[PDB]
Amino acid sequence: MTNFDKISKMFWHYKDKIAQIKQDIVLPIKKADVNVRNLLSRHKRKINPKFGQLTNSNQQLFKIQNELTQLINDTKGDSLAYHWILNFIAKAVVHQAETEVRVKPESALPLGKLTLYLLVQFPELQELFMARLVKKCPFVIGFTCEIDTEKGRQNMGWKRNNENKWEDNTSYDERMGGILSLFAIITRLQLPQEFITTTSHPFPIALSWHILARICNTPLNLITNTHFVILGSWWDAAAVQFLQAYGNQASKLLILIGEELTSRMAEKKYVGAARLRILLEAWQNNNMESFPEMSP
Amino acid sequence: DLAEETLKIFRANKFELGLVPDIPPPPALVA
Ligand code: PRO
């Protein structure tokens, strides 16, 4: 069972943290001196292109890791600049998941590897990153509320198309799927050899169990197409490794989301539910896919 | 610390909506 008061408390903890990020970091930098703002502008735009330069190549991954670490280290003495840049990185990584991973899901693999590396090299990033994930995509911790009211829409990460028109369903769903794709990857990657003996994985595979369990425990009147979308994005990114981790228990939970949850919502004809059932069927036919291994 | 009811659920051949254990099973409960 799931205690939804504690998940709600966890949601509003990260929502309070987003608010704390704005007051204690963003405005200080807005009210700050010019020579430092220019340096951070030079650094801000020297950093942003790196995420797009990732490819399916490990050699290229290691290059981008190194170059981002040198740029973050340029601020390590300066707490306000250091936390401002990590907040920026956390935003840029989520934005990449919302945009590039959306159109090319397999690009979540290199990006997740890069993010996991940054999360252990610079562990102040963990709370900044998780706060940004929860605010923009509350499915990452299994939070769900009604989206009939304007306040509920906002909590669940919806944007405005204009004044009093919500962003279209496809836009929202594909953004959520891309973000969750990235997080899914991270939970099923192992730490690099440089950290794995010394450091706990900061976002381990247990967190994928939480997502599936909590959605399966969510009152069905709150389930929407987006739950099925993010579960399918999750599946393409991590189902193979989830089965490796939890075996028969993973299998029971995959059956629960792919057969039972889709069946119970069948009359809604959610496009995401149809795709999740197709993924279940591929697994049942010993044809489960995973993203191709990265090349040399 | 795992309740007997949770152990029973992990022993079963299925989970049910609303009753999935929030915390993943330890290795001892994976076949
Ligand atoms: O740990 C406990 O207290 C649960 C209660 C039922 C049996 N075991």
Author numbering:
A (entry chain B): 243 to 538
B (entry chain D): 400 to 430
Pull text from the paper.
When we recombinantly purified the minimal S. cerevisiae Gle1CTD•Nup42GBM complex, we noticed that the purified complex was more stable than apo Gle1CTD, which typically requires the addition of IP6 in purification buffers for stability. To understand the molecular basis for the interaction between Gle1CTD and Nup42GBM and the resulting stabilization of Gle1CTD, we determined the crystal structure of S. cerevisiae Gle1CTD•Nup42GBM at 1.75 Å resolution. Nup42GBM folds into a compact domain with a hydrophobic core that buries a solvent-exposed hydrophobic surface on Gle1CTD, yielding an interaction interface area of ~835 Å2. Consistent with the extensive interaction surface, the interaction between Gle1CTD and Nup42GBM was robust against several individual alanine substitutions in SEC experiments. Instead, highly disruptive substitutions that introduced negative charge into the hydrophobic core (F414D or F409D/F414D) were required to completely disrupt the interaction between Gle1CTD and Nup42GBM. In agreement with these results, Nup42 variants containing the F414D or F409D/F414D substitutions were unable to rescue Nup42 deletion in S. cerevisiae. Burial of the exposed hydrophobic residues and the thermodynamic favorability of Nup42GBM binding and folding explain the large effect Nup42GBM has on Gle1CTD stability. Our Gle1CTD•Nup42GBM structure reveals that Nup42GBM interacts with Gle1CTD at a surface that is distinct and well separated from the IP6 binding pocket and the Dbp5 interface. However, there were minimal conformational differences in Gle1CTD between our Gle1CTD•Nup42GBM structure and the previously reported structure of Gle1CTD•IP6•Dbp5. Additionally, IP6 bound tightly to S. cerevisiae Gle1CTD•Nup42GBM in isothermal titration calorimetry experiments (ITC) with a dissociation constant (Kd) of ~3 nM.
At the cytoplasmic face of the NPC, Nxf1•Nxt1-bound mRNPs encounter the cytoplasmic filament nucleoporins Gle1, Nup42, and Nup214, which specifically activate the DEAD-box helicase DDX19 to remove Nxf1•Nxt1 from the mRNP8. DDX19 is a member of the DEAD-box helicase family, which are RNA-dependent ATPases composed of two RecA domains (referred to as DDX19NTD and DDX19CTD throughout the text). Gle1CTD plays an important organizational role by providing spatially separated binding sites for Nup42GBM and the DEAD-box helicase DDX19/scDbp5. A comprehensive structure-function analysis of DDX19 indicates that binding of Gle1CTD•Nup42GBM induces a conformational change in DDX19, thereby stimulating its ATPase activity.
